[PDB]
A = this chain, B = another copy of it.
Amino acid sequence: PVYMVYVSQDRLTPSAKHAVAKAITDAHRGLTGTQHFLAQVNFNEQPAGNVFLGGVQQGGDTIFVHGLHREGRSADLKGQLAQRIVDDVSVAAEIDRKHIWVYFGEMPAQQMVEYGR
């Protein structure tokens, strides 16, 4: 799959970015059984002040993980994976769980290409 991770520039050091990527990647491999190399984590950073919750401009602590998955997994599994990402990312980024949002989108495998194949 592909995990788009939206964070504020400078909030995560290159070291934290790696730890967050590993956390997400390990959770996915661990719970779905999909090979590690098949998981992409793409960080999209924006200047502080581009996030609004309830119309209020936030700091740089929000982290929105948008996971693009292959269809076919149970609701219970996706639920566990979503929670696992929250707990592990919170630890990896040393950021309070309340700052983490996670949304999973699905698509049939037939319209998904990874590594050009």
* Number of chain A interface residues as a range: 35 or more
Complex contact B55–A36 (CB within 8 A): yes
Complex contact A103–B2 (CB within 8 A): yes
Q: Is the interface of A mostly helix, strand, loop or mixed?
A: mixed
Give the docked Cα–Cα distance between A29 and B96 (Å).
26
Complex contact B105–A113 (CB within 8 A): no
Further 8 A-B residue pairs, CB within 8 A, beyond A104-B111, A104-B112: A2-B66, A26-B55, A40-B64, A42-B50, A78-B111, A83-B113, A104-B107, A106-B107
CB contacts under 8 Å to B, within A59-104, are 62, 64, 66, 68, 75, 78-79, 82-83, 86, 90, 96-104
Residues of chain B within 8 A of A78, CB atoms compared: 110-111
CB of A3, distance to nearest CB on chain B (Å)? 9
